[PDB]
Amino acid sequence: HTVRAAGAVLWRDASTVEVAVIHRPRYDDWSLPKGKLDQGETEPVAAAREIHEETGHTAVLGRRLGRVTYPIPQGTKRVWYWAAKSTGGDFSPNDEVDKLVWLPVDAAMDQLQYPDDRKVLRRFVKRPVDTKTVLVVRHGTAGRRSRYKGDDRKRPLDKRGRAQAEALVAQLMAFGATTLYAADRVRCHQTIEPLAQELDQLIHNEPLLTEEAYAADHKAARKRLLEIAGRPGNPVICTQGKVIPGLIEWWCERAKVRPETTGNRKGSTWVLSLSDGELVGADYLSPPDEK
Numbered sequence: 001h002t003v004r005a006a007g008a009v010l011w012r013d014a015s016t017v018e019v020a021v022i023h024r025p026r027y028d029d030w031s032l033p034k035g036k037l038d039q040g041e042t043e044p045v046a047a048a049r050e051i052h053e054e055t056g057h058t059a060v061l062g063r064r065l066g067r068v069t070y071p072i073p074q075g076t077k078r079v080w081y082w083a084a085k086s087t088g089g090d091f092s093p094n095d096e097v098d099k100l101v102w103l104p105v106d107a108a109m110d111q112l113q114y115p116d117d118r119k120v121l122r123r124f125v126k127r128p129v130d131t132k133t134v135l136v137v138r139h140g141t142a143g144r145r146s147r148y149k150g151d152d153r154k155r156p157l158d159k160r161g162r163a164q165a166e167a168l169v170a171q172l173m174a175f176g177a178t179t180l181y182a183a184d185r186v187r188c189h190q191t192i193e194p195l196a197q198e199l200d201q202l203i204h205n206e207p208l209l210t211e212e213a214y215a216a217d218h219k220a221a222r223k224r225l226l227e228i229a230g231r232p233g234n235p236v237i238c239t240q241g242k243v244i245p246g247l248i249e250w251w252c253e254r255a256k257v258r259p260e261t262t263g264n265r266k267g268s269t270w271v272l273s274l275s276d277g278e279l280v281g282a283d284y285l286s287p288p289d290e291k
């Protein structure tokens with residue numbers, strides 16, 4: 001059996017980057033915060049939970065730092081790691097962690113004993129970490145254009161898609177979503193309506209980011225993407241299957257960013273990490289009810 005886990009390089013602004021290293025009595029080891037996925041939990045949601053459970057900090061996830069695989073007695077441990085900025089809380093000793101230290105990255109590398117954690121910290125230092133995040137979401141499942149009676153623009157999410165929309169709230173809050181944009185289609189708006197309620201935030205309607213608009217004027221949609229991305233906060237943009245591959249691929253080619261994963265599924269999220277207006281990460285997340 002392979003055990004699926006997620007964790008983070010939790011860091012704070014000391015005033016100046018310091019990274020958290022945790023000590024576990026059981027092993028007498030120093031490592032990065034991580035833990036197993038609960039039933040129905042996505043990797044990002046688990047990473048955020050495990051930060052809170054092991055360090056007592058609240059954090060916002062940024063750039064994905066790849067995956068590690070190592071043997072355990074039970075078989076194989078597989079862990080996805082995120083950069084995560086502390087936004088609050090404080091260390092409290094718990095059932096697994098008795099000590100936490102905050103170190104500059106060079107001192108943290110020496111403190112970490114496992115090769116796979118040092119691999120992860122090397123990925124963390126290679127690019128900026130004080131990032132802002134654009135979250136590009138394909139709308140949830142919404143049935144078939146082929147069977148819909150009515151204006152197709154009005155076609156609503158189906159039951160599965162409404163569940164994806166509810167499950168995206170925890171997914172997008174883990175990345176500190178703060179502002180909301182949707183293509184001018186009901187199924188796009190309904191996908192981030194639950195997040196809108198959680199944030200008490202209005203969704204801005206985007207006629208330039210529909211399939212029809214994108215197909216006829218790609219350049220207007222690319223400019224509007226960069227305009228949204230330039231605004232303060234972490235925007236969510238919910239759009240359609242025939243828009244997202246083109247925008248992501250165009251931005252990754254121009255920035256020379258290589259996505260480690262890829263897909264275009266209904267309910268999927270691209271996590272675009274920006275530092276000083278430059279793309280530094282493009283992280284594909286499966287739909288919350290897939291994997």
Ligand SMILES: Nc1nc2c([nH]c(=O)n2[C@H]2C[C@H](O)[C@@H](COP(=O)(O)OP(=O)(O)O)O2)c(=O)[nH]1
Pocket residue numbers: 027031032068070071072077114115116117
């Ligand atoms: N945390 C961690 N443990 C590692 C790594 N490499 C390695 O060999 N180990 C060892 C530490 C242990 O010997 C073993 C399992 O530790 P864990 O995955 O933390 O699982 P548990 O929380 O106990 O369920 O792998 C590594 O990169 N990180």
Ligand SMILES: [Mg+2]
Pocket residue numbers: 033034035036096
């Ligand atoms: Mg753990």
